[PDB]
RNA sequence: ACGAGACUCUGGCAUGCUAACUAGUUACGCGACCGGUCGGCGUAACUUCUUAGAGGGACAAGUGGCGUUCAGCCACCCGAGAUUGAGCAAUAACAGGUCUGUGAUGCCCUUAGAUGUCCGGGGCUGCACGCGCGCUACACUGACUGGCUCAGCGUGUGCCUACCCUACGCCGGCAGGCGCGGGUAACCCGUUGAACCCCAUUCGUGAUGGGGAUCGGGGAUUGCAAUUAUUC
């Protein structure tokens, strides 16, 4: 049983699986404060103190993540937290507090539950990238 | 109740130079625990101001070969250094850069000729986030310059290079270029 | 700390203009037949504390370094990672001190030039031979 | 010269040989009766201040 | 056997498509249990040639690509059946295969 | 209680496992300790002078997170990138030999042991002991 | 021929190690090794031995950046 | 009217729909302490991550400013997205290249070289040289076991031919050989465990562990011979 909500950043995907719990939170065999870059951790612990450790106390959220890359796994884990912790709250509890958490999180962060549609560019030939050229003698 | 990185505070600034206060992001709603966020600050104007001064700073610092795209290692010559400059002055590190940047940040320098002219130039105003953008490209150059072909490493060029463009030494690069722009606006009237 | 007695500046291992501010295994790669790797193998088979420089160390480690660098086969140290292996005329065997065998190993270079060989000659002029291709090679400083 | 800060209040337009002058009508908050054009340089929005140390010069126009 | 496979390759998605719904329908007319057309990942053969049949010219290269669709359909049908379900209604251009399964 | 290997910080996890290996001395003692290269890529000298102990407990490690991995696998987990000299550099396998014996070194001595029909099976002595020196390390200096 | 610098715990090495560097919040390898004209190698092993002889905090060493903070 | 645009494929959003033991989310027999790690399993909540099928969605649509008070441009609550990237691409032309693609071609070769059969060997791999693309380096933002964490495009069992990707154990520090085979493929490689981030031990301003003909000797592929040897 999940919340069904999913989360993405490039072409890396979470989801955080819902349970009713006491807000232990878990990454695909870890919890969130054990991963491994220790730079990237403030980027996982943003949602636990963006809004506090009350409202991660009521809920067990496992987050699987499949995706490339490490920053990109991350971006991932946190939005999927975040926008699971919204989703259950509203279709569980109420909307009141389920709104002021979403305006929390915009207002910290407008891209903290919508997605980043930005993907890598495809490759014209000619060049090595997609907008370098092959150089050239005159 | 937010705090830089985990303990530097957003409450101990202040701008006071009026000039260029909304291109600097310390104190408003721009707080965040970790100088790496990416974001679509470089894909609109009107919106690349809002990024947070240091998110600006921090993005700024990789250049040259590999360096470039390296924005991890930024965030840890940026915790870095920062923890140096904090126990070598006492003082909170986020009001030193502000006053780096105000006292780095030129005033008025020379383009072309009003209307039309390329023999010469004449001096304008600097727009203030131009300026701001002058300041961060002359504290990273300087802080590598510094590190070139010397014994000592990352994390003090930077280091030293904040701490005397807040102060006004002669040693910084910032603040020198600084001078320097201002000399070339009044040779060029 | 201060070691009162018997510090070298000159280090020497056998007629080698070697340095004595070099770290241990930095300064004894100028042996011509083994170093680097090789070098490292040896004294860390030889139980030397790398923590040290080559300074501050009694002559004894230095001896044993020595004698187990003259005599590779006693040690434990195999027949494939050394460059003295059989080859033309007899095999060879001991690595020596400097270039006791480089010269041995130039001779058989002298040999590839004195009997008119196609790869003989080609060495003798100048021109590399394992597939090294030649399209801006000997352009500067040439005749 | 005296110090006295100029606030944007129209983006007149682009001037300079590569078009990187900005012509800009900037107010002295003393007396809001001077409004004179400048010219300059850098990403300039509308509504920010200009420090001035300087204002006997004024920017072609007209 | 019980349990047979029906494979659909079809390079055109259109007439893949047409040839599932015959089938289901087919499969409807008479009263047997079918599980839902199961859609694999498309195969794109994306292969790369130069344009002009000589080297004079700038870099330009033609980009062909070939994409096949594949469908699967597992029933619970003897073969007698299962044989006149499949020769009922088709349309050229998709393949059709019977595997035990 | 109990507490798993997934859950304690890798880095001190991987050293308290090479210090048992060293303290436990079960298992075959490595014959090549300095004598190699190692990896294939690398033409540079080892340094820990434990890279067996510590790729023996590596390769625990490896196959508690993905139970099955052996050879040809454990090359792909120990490949690296490769200096073809004056080229570009590549990805290189890592020493087939060289993890092979560090598998037989496990193999049949009751916390690890690879079959001949695919897949690994872990003995209760070997996860119950890991266990317990992953939960040592977490209580003991990691968590309070 | 090649710079001097000392790569060894000598007299101008003990001399204004452990009584006058506490002074100074800036304590890094770097420093140390221009101001005793020594090599970054001794210097990091220096803090190292002063840092065991449980003299000064540590705050972070990622392979040679370290910071030592006082408290006085 | 053609071209532009429109168009098609793509890149992004639908917890709306047709649905999937070649995909997972849910189904539990150590519950390892008296509420928990699983791809260490301790061997029937169904399409939410995965899969591209049909519809939908964005139109400058709302607000404000400027503007013939038009066409439009700029800024914003909102929204997945407020300019994705490509494909195609007119009239005319160039003495542009291609006879090195062929009875698709208009001229010479007919008298034993007419190629329709053939080559044992060397040629563009070798040179006083000038040039063009790109790589390895330009430092102590770099390195000296790397110890732990991942995806993306997509290719692969062949009848002109063992001429594939190879999972697992044996032989050795090594190129490579043996076996059982898994894969004709969302069935196996593959959950495609590289680049990276770490370090309470080791480089320190050299000409060098930032580096290459590191000169010369140890290597070899169920397949004509690795010769200024394009494999090692």
């Known amino acids: 049983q999940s919340v069904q909500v999913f989360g993405r950043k490039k072409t890396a995907t979470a989801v955080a699986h819902c349970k009713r719990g006491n807000g232990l939170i878990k990454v695909n065999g870890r919890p969130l404060e054990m991963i491994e870059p220790r730079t990237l951790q403030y980027k996982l612990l943003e949602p636990v103190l963006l809004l506090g450790k009350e409202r991660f106390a009521g809920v067990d959220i496992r987050v699987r993540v499949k995706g490339g890359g490490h920053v990109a796994q991350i971006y991932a884990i946190r939005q999927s937290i975040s926008k699971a912790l919204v989703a259950y709250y509203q279709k569980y509890v109420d909307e009141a507090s389920k709104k002021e958490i979403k305006d929390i999180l ?21 060049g090595p990238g997609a907008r370098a050229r092959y150089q050239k003698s005159y | 109740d937010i705090k830089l990185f985990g303990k530097w505070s957003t409450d101990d600034v202040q701008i006071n130079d009026i000039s260029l206060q909304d291109y600097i992001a310390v104190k408003e709603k721009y707080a965040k625990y970790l100088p790496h966020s990416a974001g679509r600050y ?56 502000v006053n780096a940047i105000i006292n780095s940040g030129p005033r008025e320098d020379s383009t072309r000729i009003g209307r039309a002219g390329t023999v010469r130039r004449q001096a304008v105003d600097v727009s203030p986030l131009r300026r701001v953008n002058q300041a961060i490209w002359l504290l990273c150059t ?31 690069y910032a603040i020198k270029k600084k001078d320097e722009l201002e000399r070339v606006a009044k040779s060029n009237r | 700390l201060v070691i009162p007695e ?8 056998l007629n080698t203009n070697i340095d004595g501010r070099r770290k241990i295994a930095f300064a004894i790669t100028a042996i011509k037949g083994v170093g680097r790797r090789y070098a490292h193998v040896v004294l860390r088979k030889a139980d030397i504390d790398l923590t040290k420089r080559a300074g501050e160390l009694t002559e004894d480690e230095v001896e044993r370094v020595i004698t187990i660098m003259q005599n590779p086969r006693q040690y434990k140290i195999p027949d494939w990672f050394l460059n003295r292996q059989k080859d033309v005329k007899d095999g060879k065997y001991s690595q020596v001190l400097a270039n006791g065998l480089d010269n041995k190993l130039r001779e058989d270079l002298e040999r590839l030039k004195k009997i008119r060989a196609h790869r003989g000659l080609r060495h003798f002029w100048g021109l590399r031979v394992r597939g090294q291709h030649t399209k801006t090679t000997g352009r500067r400083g040439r005749t | 010269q005296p110090i006295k800060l100029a606030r944007v209040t129209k983006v007149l337009g682009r001037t300079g040989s590569q078009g990187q002058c900005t012509q800009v009508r900037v107010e002295f908050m003393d007396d809001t009766s001077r409004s004179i054009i400048r010219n300059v340089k850098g990403p300039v929005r509308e509504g920010d201040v200009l420090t001035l140390l300087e204002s006997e010069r004024e920017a072609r126009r007209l | 056997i019980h349990r047979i496979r029906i494979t659909l390759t079809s390079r055109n998605v259109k007439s893949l498509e047409k040839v599932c719904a015959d089938l289901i329908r087919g499969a409807k007319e008479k009263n047997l249990k079918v599980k839902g057309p199961v859609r694999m990942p498309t195969k794109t053969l994306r292969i790369t040639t130069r344009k002009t049949p000589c080297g004079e010219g700038s870099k330009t290269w033609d980009r062909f690509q070939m994409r096949i669709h594949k469908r699967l359909i597992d029933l619970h049908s003897p073969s007698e059946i299962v044989k006149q379900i499949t020769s009922i209604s088709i349309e050229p251009g998709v393949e059709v295969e019977v595997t035990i399964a | 209680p109990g507490v798993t290997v997934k859950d304690v910080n890798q880095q001190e996890f991987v050293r308290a496992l090479a210090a048992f290996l060293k303290k436990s001395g079960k298992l075959k003692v490595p014959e090549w300790v300095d004598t190699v290269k190692l990896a294939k890529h690398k033409e540079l000298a080892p340094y820990d002078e434990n890279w067996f102990y510590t790729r023996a407990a590596s390769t ?25 000299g004056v080229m570009p550099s590549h990805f290189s396998r890592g020493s087939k030999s060289v993890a092979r014996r560090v598998l037989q070194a496990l193999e049949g001595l009751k916390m690890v042991e690879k079959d001949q029909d695919g897949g690994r099976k872990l003995t209760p002595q070997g996860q119950r002991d890991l266990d317990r020196i992953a939960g040592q390390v977490a209580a003991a200096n990691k968590k309070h | 021929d090649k710079l001097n610098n000392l790569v060894l715990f000598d007299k101008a090495t003990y001399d204004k190690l452990c009584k006058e560097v506490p002074n100074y919040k800036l304590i890094t390898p770097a420093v140390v090794s221009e101001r005793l004209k020594i090599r970054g190698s001794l210097a990091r092993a220096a803090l190292q031995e002063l840092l065991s002889k449980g003299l000064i905090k540590l705050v972070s060493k990622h392979r040679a950046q370290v910071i030592y903070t006082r408290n006085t």
């Open chain 1, 106 to 126: 915009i207002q910290y962060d407008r891209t903290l539950l919508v997605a980043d549609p930005r993907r890598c560019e495809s490759k014209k030939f000619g």
């Open chain 2, 42 to 97: 470089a894909a609109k104007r009107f919106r690349k101001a809002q990024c947070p001064i240091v998110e600006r700073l921090t993005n700024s610092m990789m250049m040259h070969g590999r360096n470039n795209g390296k924005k991890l290692m930024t965030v840890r010559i940026v915790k870095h250094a920062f923890e140096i400059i904090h126990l070598l002055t006492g003082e909170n590190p986020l009001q030193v850069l």
């Open chain 2, 142 to 172: 300087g802080a590598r310059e510094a590190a070139f072909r010397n014994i000592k490493t990352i994390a003090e060029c930077l280091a030293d290079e904040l701490i005397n463009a807040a102060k006004g030494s002669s040693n910084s």
């Open chain 3, 6 to 13: 018997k510090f070298q500046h000159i280090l020497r291992v």
């Open chain 6, 60 to 84: 625990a490690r490896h196959l508690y997170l993905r139970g099955g991995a052996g050879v040809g696998s454990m090359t792909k987990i120990y490949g690296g990138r490769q200096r073809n």
